[PDB]
Design a protein around this ligand. Structure first.
Ligand SMILES: CCCCCCCCCCCCCCCCCC(=O)OC[C@H](COP(=O)(O)O)OC(=O)CCCCCCCCCCCCCCCCC
Ligand SMILES: CCCCCCCCCCCCCCCCCC(=O)OC[C@H](COP(=O)(O)O)OC(=O)CCCCCCCCCCCCCCCCC
Ligand SMILES: *[C@@H]1O[C@H](CO)[C@@H](O[C@@H]2O[C@H](CO)[C@@H](O)[C@H](O)[C@H]2NC(C)=O)[C@H](O)[C@H]1NC(C)=O
Ligand SMILES: *[C@@H]1O[C@H](CO)[C@@H](O[C@@H]2O[C@H](CO)[C@@H](O)[C@H](O)[C@H]2NC(C)=O)[C@H](O)[C@H]1NC(C)=O
Ligand SMILES: *[C@@H]1O[C@H](CO)[C@@H](O[C@@H]2O[C@H](CO)[C@@H](O)[C@H](O)[C@H]2NC(C)=O)[C@H](O)[C@H]1NC(C)=O
Ligand SMILES: *[C@@H]1O[C@H](CO)[C@@H](O[C@@H]2O[C@H](CO)[C@@H](O)[C@H](O)[C@H]2NC(C)=O)[C@H](O)[C@H]1NC(C)=O
Lengths: 457, 469
């Protein structure tokens, strides 16, 4: 369908990171002049990235996503190393942030001018997850209705911010801020700019492993690459209009202070100010870790089938079936990031390995443009476009060792831990035979423990 | 594939494994409700918030006295429309208001020929004045209109019969509020007979239209007891005086005035100015100019300044000049009578590029005063230190705490900042980051040690340290 290719794909890319990241670009850019440039410079950069995946999703198109696209290209311990990162780094830490933001927009309507304690925002973050991972261990068809009510709340909040931000300039005192004092200034050109970009890049993502099923179910067939070029400028439009409601109605010191900017817009604008904003921002962040648990199970079914990822996972329950050993594995790793210090220390830790996973996936496209031609590419983009993409993406990582190398130091530590469990995983000689009974011993204990049965082999 | 099949599992998993499955399921919702109220504990025994104290617009930054426009610009430009281009400079200082005037019709020394409602045509007309208010209000700089009647003679208040003189003030407060001014000022009310009854009536009139309007008043009095007679029935009345103007030049003498004037009023809003009309260089030597400023921008109240206070405008350093209203200097071409008597450092332009100048000190302080919620309306507590110091702390609810250290003597000392009296909410740490200094030669950003803090002769320090326990 012509328009429904956009309407499905716009609500997918609008995430709940828009209620977090305006504070994080503002403290790494200085003024709203250079802050609104970062929202536009992240605007264009993600049209380039989604075109690189609009073609790469169509060439191979097996099943299993970004992992399986690299499984075709390398097909060895590079594939497991890419799998060892997403189970441990990308998928846990991005769910913690949305859970941590669900806390601070729920505990900030009763702490109006002060700061929420660190130790209490974590225990409402953990509570939100463990509550929500247990719904998905129960009825899936009940949890899918729960996915319905949170799409509507994410749009009612982001419009009511606008229509109150629209009349606030129309009531009087046009250009109530007019601040661009560091639009030419406060710019280190290496450190603070990239750190402001990581907050902007987080703000809408999921143009990578979410669009391939989005096109597939209608089969409109290769009018999708225009359908994202229509779509992603609508998202950069909404993500810039919402900052215009922030910089006018708030100040640049009231914004960088608080943790919930959306309630400061809500507090000043209206006196009801409690039934509206932290509810609608609260339901919106409550859905992005719900729907991150529907789609979490798909990865396990692909990895265990290929001989990676030992087969305790990818087993499903009897009555009221739901992938139970997988959801337990994700929620444990999610709560292991409750040992973290700052939320923008997590976004900088998340987006380091997100944007190295993306960059090697597209270097592997050029080496599949160099080597192995005639693979029936339904979509081929101009090859000058992906080399715009890598040369920027090496520029993000190479400055991220000049800036905060200790978190990337423990990030390369955890991927040297995936190397011996690779050699223990598939390369290992089953010669000593003491362990082969034990692997069967350990696995059948968990099946008796959880009541989970294998796939229909 | 290493497993037990669907049918083989339903053989093996049934017996008493059902009970250890219902036990781990029931231990979940207990370990969930255990984490539930374990968070609800922390949300109840948490220190709450102080509610914010409904500030007015003058609370939030300095004011600025401009008495002589003639000087304020120069020759040829001494008018209201030539003043209207200066708001780019006045917002460079981040002031929040202007003491403007007096601009009304004063011939000389005559009651019947002094009309407060008519402007003096040496400045412009009412339409020029309405151009000024409307241009200022776009930058959010309010305009306070000075209404001292005989602003050209010896006695300011026309020594003959007075109830018609106050009647001229009684309608002039009605007139200019309709034009939309946001505040007034009378001066020299020691020349007013029964000041405390007319001021309280005019305060009823300035608050009679709205509550966003103020009424400053001046006197040459430095008597602590005489001021409080004026502030007896009136509490929402600003009142500048020469109370701090008498020197002493010592800290414990200066400490005694600030504490007592706060103690005798309690905790109301002050207005920390040296005099009612003049400059700071009238009452201070050349090296204390950098040192008050900082103290002025940090005490609880509204600092009130005059033009040239930020550049060190010294009338004694430049001959051929009226003490009452010195040449508002701007550039090297600012003193047209004797060329070469003005150095590069002296004008607005030459100091606007040096990061160590006195005007560079004024913009950093007026920045922090208008943004930091401690220096906006945090509470004031001083404490004892060495013999020639004056140190104090500004601190609000949970925001950033501030520490000021001033050395009013010319002997280089150490700190000795014994707190011993402050609450735990404003308890000092061992180390604290340095924000600025008056003398150059410090590492701005490095946390200094307060017990090993050594002071230089005439050096101020502003430090900061966060809320902790
Ligand atoms: C945390 C969640 C618990 C609930 C879910 C249970 C999941 C259990 C496994 C968790 C880890 C899963 C990823 C393992 C890494 C991939 C390995 C792989 O792909 O092998 C395929 C391989 C093939 O399985 P198959 O396809 O079923 O034949 O499976 C295995 O080899 C299982 C090997 C288990 C041990 C992994 C290596 C651990 C070495 C360090 C052990 C340290 C223990 C702690 C010491 C004491 C500390 C106090
Ligand atoms: C203070 C810290 C928080 C407290 C504990 C934190 C961690 C708790 C475990 C993870 C969070 C559990 C979320 C809830 C999951 C169950 C929700 C549900 O109702 O499902 C219905 C599900 C199906 O119902 P059924 O038909 O009765 O089986 O219930 C279960 O299958 C039981 C699930 C409970 C498992 C809890 C303990 C996990 C065992 C991990 C084994 C680890 C050793 C093996 C080696 C691997 C490690 C290397
Ligand atoms: C207005 O000024 C008067 C006279 O100085 C102050 O005293 C009030 O006088 C009015 C006259 O009726 C009385 O109703 C009040 O009771 C007096 N004060 C009090 C206690 O309210 C008065 O304080 C000034 N402003 C006001 C009215 O608050
Ligand atoms: C305010 O300034 C005047 C001007 O010198 C001080 O002196 C008074 O002057 C008037 C007439 O000019 C006399 O009638 C007074 O008797 C003078 N005062 C005294 C104490 O002799 C006046 O003292 C100053 N006010 C204060 C409070 O010091
Ligand atoms: C000044 O503030 C202090 C409290 O800090 C009070 O002074 C007290 O005054 C009484 C009576 O003169 C003495 O018995 C106390 O010893 C004083 N205490 C201190 C700490 O000095 C009082 O509130 C204020 N002074 C006056 C005169 O009101
Ligand atoms: C510009 O400032 C300089 C330096 O502060 C002044 O030149 C000094 O004047 C003092 C007078 O007390 C002399 O003691 C110094 O020897 C002078 N310094 C130099 C380097 O010669 C100068 O006076 C200032 N500008 C004006 C017009 O006063």
């Amino acid at each position: 369908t012509l328009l429904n290719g956009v309407a499905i794909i716009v609500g997918t890319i609008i995430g709940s990171g828009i209620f977090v990241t305006p504070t994080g670009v503002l403290k790494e850019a200085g003024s709203p002049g250079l802050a609104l440039v970062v929202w536009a410079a992240c605007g264009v950069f993600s049209i380039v990235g989604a075109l690189c995946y609009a073609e790469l999703g169509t060439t191979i198109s097996k099943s299993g996503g970004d992992y399986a696209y690299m499984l075709e290209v390398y097909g060895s311990l590079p594939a497991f190393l890419k799998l060892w990162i997403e189970l441990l780094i990308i998928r846990p830490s991005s769910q913690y942030i949305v859970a941590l933001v669900f806390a601070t927009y729920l505990l900030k309507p009763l702490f109006p001018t002060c700061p929420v304690p660190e130790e209490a925002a974590k225990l409402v973050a953990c509570l939100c997850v463990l509550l929500l991972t247990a719904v998905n261990c129960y009825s899936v068809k009940a949890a899918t209705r729960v996915q319905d009510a949170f799409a509507a709340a994410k749009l009612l909040a982001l419009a009511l911010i606008i229509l109150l931000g629209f009349v606030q300039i129309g009531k009087g005192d046009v250009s109530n801020l007019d601040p661009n004092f560091s639009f030419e200034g406060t710019k280190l050109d290496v450190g603070n700019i990239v750190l402001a970009l990581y907050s902007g890049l987080f703000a809408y993502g999921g143009w990578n492993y979410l669009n391939f099923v989005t096109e597939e179910m209608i089969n409109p067939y290769r009018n999708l690459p225009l359908a994202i070029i229509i779509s992603l400028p609508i998202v950069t439009l909404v993500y810039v209009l919402t900052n215009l409601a922030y910089f006018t109605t708030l100040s640049t010191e009231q914004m960088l202070s608080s943790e919930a900017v959306a309630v400061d817009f809500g507090n000043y604008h209206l006196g009801v100010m409690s039934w509206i904003i932290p509810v609608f921002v609260g339901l919106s962040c409550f859905g992005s870790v719900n729907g991150s648990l529907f789609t979490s199970s798909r990865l396990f079914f692909v990895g265990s089938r290929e001989g990676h990822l030992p087969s305790i996972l990818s087993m499903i329950h009897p009555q009221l079936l739901t992938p139970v050993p997988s959801l337990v594995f994700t929620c444990v790793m999610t709560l292991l990031y409750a040992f973290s210090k700052d939320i923008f220390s997590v976004i900088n830790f998340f987006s380091f390995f997100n944007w190295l996973c993306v960059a090697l996936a597209i270097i592997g496209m050029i080496w599949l443009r160099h080597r192995k031609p005639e693979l029936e590419r339904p979509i081929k983009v101009n090859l000058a476009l992906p080399v715009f993409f890598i040369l920027a993406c090496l520029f993000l990582i190479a400055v991220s060792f000049w800036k905060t190398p200790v978190e990337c130091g423990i990030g390369f530590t955890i991927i040297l831990s995936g190397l011996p469990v690779y050699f223990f995983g598939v390369w290992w000689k089953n010669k000593p035979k003491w362990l082969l009974q034990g692997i069967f011993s350990t696995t059948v204990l968990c099946q008796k423990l959880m009541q989970v049965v294998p796939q229909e082999t | 594939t290493g497993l037990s099949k669907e049918e083989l599992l339903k053989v093996a998993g049934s017996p008493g494994w059902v009970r250890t499955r219902w036990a781990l399921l029931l231990l979940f919702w207990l370990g969930w409700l255990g984490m539930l109220a374990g968070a609800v504990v922390i949300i109840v025994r948490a220190p709450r918030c102080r509610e914010l104290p409904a500030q007015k617009w003058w609370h939030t930054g300095a004011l600025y006295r401009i008495g002589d426009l003639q000087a304020f610009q120069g020759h040829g430009a001494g008018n209201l429309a030539g003043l209207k281009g200066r708001l780019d400079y006045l917002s460079s200082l981040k002031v929040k208001g202007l003491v403007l005037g007096p601009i009304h019709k004063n011939q000389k020394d005559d009651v019947a020929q002094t009309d407060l409602l008519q402007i003096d045509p040496n400045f412009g007309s009412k339409e020029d004045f309405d151009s000024l208010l409307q241009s200022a209000k776009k930058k959010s700089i309010r305009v306070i209109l000075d209404l001292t009647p005989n602003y050209r003679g010896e006695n300011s208040w026309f020594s003959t019969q007075v109830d018609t003189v106050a009647t001229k003030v009684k309608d002039a407060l009605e007139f200019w509020l309709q034009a939309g001014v946001d505040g007034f000022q009378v001066r020299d009310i020691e020349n007013l007979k029964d000041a405390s009854s007319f001021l309280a009536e005019w305060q009823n009139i300035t608050k009679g239209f709205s509550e966003d309007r103020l009424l400053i008043a001046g006197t040459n009095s430095s008597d602590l007891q005489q001021i409080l007679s004026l502030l007896e029935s009136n509490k929402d009345l600003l009142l500048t005086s020469s109370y701090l103007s008498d020197s002493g030049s010592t800290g414990e003498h200066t400490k005694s005035l600030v504490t007592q004037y706060l103690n005798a009023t309690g905790n109301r809003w002050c207005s920390w100015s040296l005099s009612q009309a003049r400059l700071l260089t009238s009452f201070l030597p050349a090296q204390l100019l950098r040192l008050y400023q900082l103290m002025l921008f940090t005490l609880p109240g509204t600092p009130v300044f005059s033009y040239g206070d930020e550049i060190g405008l010294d009338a004694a350093a430049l001959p051929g000049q009226p003490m009452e209203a010195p040449v508002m200097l701007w550039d090297e071409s600012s003193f047209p009578d004797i060329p070469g008597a003005v150095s590069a450092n002296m004008t607005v332009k030459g100091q606007s590029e040096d990061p160590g100048s006195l005007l560079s000190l004024f913009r950093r302080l007026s920045d922090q005063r208008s943004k930091e919620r401690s220096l906006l309306h945090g509470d004031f507590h001083a404490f004892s230190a060495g013999p020639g110091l004056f140190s104090y702390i500004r601190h609000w609810d949970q925001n950033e705490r501030f520490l000021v250290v001033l050395n009013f003597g010319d002997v280089g000392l150490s700190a000795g900042l014994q707190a011993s009296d402050l609450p735990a909410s404003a308890s000092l740490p061992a180390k604290a980051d340095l924000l600025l200094s008056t003398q150059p030669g410090r590492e701005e950003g490095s946390p200094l040690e307060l017990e090993r803090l050594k002071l230089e002769p005439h050096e101020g320090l502003l430090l900061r340290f966060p809320y902790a326990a």
